[PDB]
Design a protein around this ligand. Structure first.
Ligand SMILES: Cc1cc2nc3c(=O)[nH]c(=O)nc-3n(C[C@H](O)[C@H](O)[C@H](O)COP(=O)(O)O)c2cc1C
Ligand SMILES: Cc1cc2nc3c(=O)[nH]c(=O)nc-3n(C[C@H](O)[C@H](O)[C@H](O)COP(=O)(O)O)c2cc1C
Ligand SMILES: [Cl-]
Ligand SMILES: [Cl-]
Ligand SMILES: [Cl-]
Ligand SMILES: [Cl-]
Ligand SMILES: [Cl-]
Ligand SMILES: [Cl-]
Ligand SMILES: [Cl-]
Ligand SMILES: [Cl-]
Ligand SMILES: [Cl-]
Ligand SMILES: [Cl-]
Ligand SMILES: [Fe+2]
Ligand SMILES: [Fe+2]
Lengths: 118, 290, 290, 118
């Protein structure tokens, strides 16, 4: 499936390169015309990057699932960007992982996305 | 001579970090720790000693990062908006240091507390560890510094921020995740959230400088960074055996040290070098519960 | 290596200053300045130019004090509780610097603002003035510093904190005391309250070191302090003629400069050297109204 | 008249040396048995030093007036220690002055204290 993502410091970008599924970094004008999974990072207090919120206003109809990169140091706010997005647009949280993710996170994500393509 | 102008961005991230530092601002007065006494007295003597010893060490690292690290790194930046964020972060390193004293003055008598501080000041592995880090900072005590010198001080910084503290942060989290000393635990959670973003920020600045080094300097600092990583890991294993053998937690702490080392590396845009393992679940619970 | 221990006081004042810094903490987001536009447009072009120019200069001094002054002074202290207060004060110097940008982005377009900053960076008297101060700080860029070197950096500090800013602070106060730009004025009032206690604090630390100097070093730094005081006054008179001749306020600003110089001296435990005059009453009203 | 005072950084102390009226720096145990004027400095937000508040609990009966040293930089909180003390113990504010005071402040104080000895 197509993955749309946003990465500020390179971690989400590193993760997506472990998938070799096709993936694109979001911008302001970007329109996505097919079913897709969003991977976002998490900004302070468990929040959603503004660029992602703006994107999703225009592209939420085809959104099929969201994963978040964060850091478990944030406790209950760990990857809570995915919680906010999931709730707002009624799609599943695919997965949460830390930073550039581990291999188990990569496999987990791949399995979940298959499952969800059902 | 230039003054800081925020209406012309010097980079694409300092403002967000400026703002998040301030949003995160807290001080010890906000968290009462008196209620921890109920669980404190149920600990064994050995547990009590380990906790105080680790708080000692945490206080040392925050002291040096606020008093040496942030000041000597920031003085040499040309990016004034980044300088600003680093000054604020250094102040927060002192807020943290003081928050450890606030914990101590419930868990211990004045005499016990001063004994811990004397122990910290005379402790050879702590001297060694803090001395390796601070030697990168004290190299910047001259008018002009090379990009390599500045890069390596920033590596040292991120290693302290994102890695070296965690042999100590382990214990308050571990106990809080068992519902013991949860007030003191909440303070440590606030500290860690600050430090986490400190590590990210300084890693960003480091990557900027790396991108400017020659291919040969790049190879040199890559080697120096791996050496420092592993030298520090070796000292941390000696420190964890000292502190935690008495309470049977040495390998758990060592695992947690590796887990955070890998995070510190990624903050530098670098590959993990220790085996990937999940976080200690009790520690995780200490991070969550509030 | 020592960690900061607040349960053993290193002096009889750092804690109170630590606490008051934090009690004073504010950030630009707390003061909306939009409402100043109503009075801003009623100013003449000459008044508008003077205001922006002075904000430029204020921003420069806070930039250097946060980026050089507090870092290089604090790195060399042995008193870790004082080091802590100075790190916090340096962060606040950046909070102030940023608060000037917040004012600017109501009073000016992005182009006007960047033009002011370019003017500040290229302005020879500002370069000179800031350069004399910062030369005391950059002397501390070495591993070991003498008490005399540290003393003189602290004198320079207090001169900046308590004296050099006031040629600039004059104007926003003067207008606010006439009910013009009172929002921007309230921000400057918060700034001045911070700086006032910064000056006191660094003057305390200076007096401690003075008491430790030999009689001969004491005589040497006393002479150097009078020289610096008067060298700076001479530059400030050149600066006030540049900025304020166009709006007829040169001698009023010069009087205010002398009044604050005397305060800075007293912060050092020293005698006033300018004639004692009451504060400008309009400026006083700018300090009061809130 | 006797002057009791408190000085943290030396300014109030310098002022009192310009008076050559008799004066004493307050402490914890100090008891004053005669009519006196208090000179205090001002702590953050226009407040009264703790040492002065403690002293005055034990010695307010003979207090005849209060002056404050402060700094006009504090605006409406300039020397407001004198306001607090005056209100709490119903005695006059003698004077407010900045730091170690000017000569006009010294003369002013002397005149006010005479006036008040009436
Ligand atoms: C200012 C800041 C605030 C953050 N806040 C959160 C948070 O609330 N929750 C979380 O799980 N991670 C948080 N993080 C961690 C990032 O989301 C994490 O490092 C992520 O991997 C960044 O992805 P990127 O490298 O692609 O930008 C924060 C990071 C920074 C720099
Ligand atoms: C932390 C601090 C807070 C202060 N707060 C106030 C204030 O609210 N009002 C005021 O007029 N002066 C205030 N001042 C100024 C002092 O009261 C002034 O410098 C006074 O002369 C000190 O007297 P001393 O040198 O005898 O201690 C403050 C000074 C400091 C250091
Ligand atoms: Cl230090
Ligand atoms: Cl983080
Ligand atoms: Cl063990
Ligand atoms: Cl690598
Ligand atoms: Cl390993
Ligand atoms: Cl600077
Ligand atoms: Cl003050
Ligand atoms: Cl004129
Ligand atoms: Cl003198
Ligand atoms: Cl004169
Ligand atoms: Fe930190
Ligand atoms: Fe200041």
């Amino acid at each position: 499936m197509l993955v749309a993502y946003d990465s500020m410091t390179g971690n989400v970008k590193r993760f997506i390169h472990k998938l070799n599924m096709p993936a694109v970094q979001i911008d302001e004008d970007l329109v996505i015309d097919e079913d897709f999974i969003l991977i976002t990072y998490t900004t302070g207090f468990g929040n959603v990057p503004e660029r992602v919120l703006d994107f999703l206003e225009r592209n939420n109809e085809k959104l099929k699932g969201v994963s978040a990169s964060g850091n478990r140091n944030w406790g209950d706010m760990f990857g809570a960007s995915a919680d906010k997005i999931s709730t707002k647009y009624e799609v599943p949280i695919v997965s949460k992982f830390e930073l550039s993710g581990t291999n188990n996170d990569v496999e987990y994500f791949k399995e979940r996305v298959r499952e969800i393509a059902t | 001579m230039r003054a800081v102008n925020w209406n012309k961005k010097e980079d694409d991230f300092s403002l967000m970090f400026w703002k998040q530092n301030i949003a995160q601002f807290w001080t010890e007065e906000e968290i009462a720790v008196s209620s921890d006494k109920n669980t404190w007295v149920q600990l064994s003597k050995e547990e009590q000693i380990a906790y105080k010893r680790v708080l000692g060490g945490l206080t040392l690292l925050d002291t040096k990062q606020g008093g040496e690290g942030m000041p000597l790194v920031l003085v040499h930046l040309e990016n004034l908006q980044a300088k600003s964020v680093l000054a604020f972060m250094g102040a927060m390193e002192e807020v943290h240091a003081k928050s450890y004293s606030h914990i101590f003055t419930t868990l211990a008598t004045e005499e016990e507390i001063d004994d811990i501080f004397d122990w910290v000041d005379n402790h050879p592995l702590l001297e060694k560890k803090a001395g390796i880090i601070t030697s990168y900072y004290r190299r910047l005590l001259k008018p002009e510094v090379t990009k390599k010198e500045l890069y390596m001080a920033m590596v040292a910084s991120v290693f302290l921020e994102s890695y070296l503290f965690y042999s100590g942060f382990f214990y308050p989290l571990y106990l809080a995740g068992q519902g013991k000393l949860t007030a003191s635990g909440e303070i440590i959670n606030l500290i860690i959230r600050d430090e986490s973003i400190h590590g990210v920020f300084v890693g960003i600045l480091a990557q900027q400088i790396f991108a400017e080094l020659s291919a040969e300097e790049q190879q040199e600092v890559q080697k120096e960074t791996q050496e420092l990583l592993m030298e520090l890991y070796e000292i941390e294993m000696a420190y964890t055996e000292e502190i935690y053998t008495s309470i049977g937690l040495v390998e758990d702490v060592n695992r947690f040290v590796r887990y955070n080392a890998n995070k510190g590396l990624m903050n530098l845009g670098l590959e993990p070098k220790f085996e990937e393992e999940e976080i200690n679940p009790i520690v995780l619970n200490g991070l969550r519960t509030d």
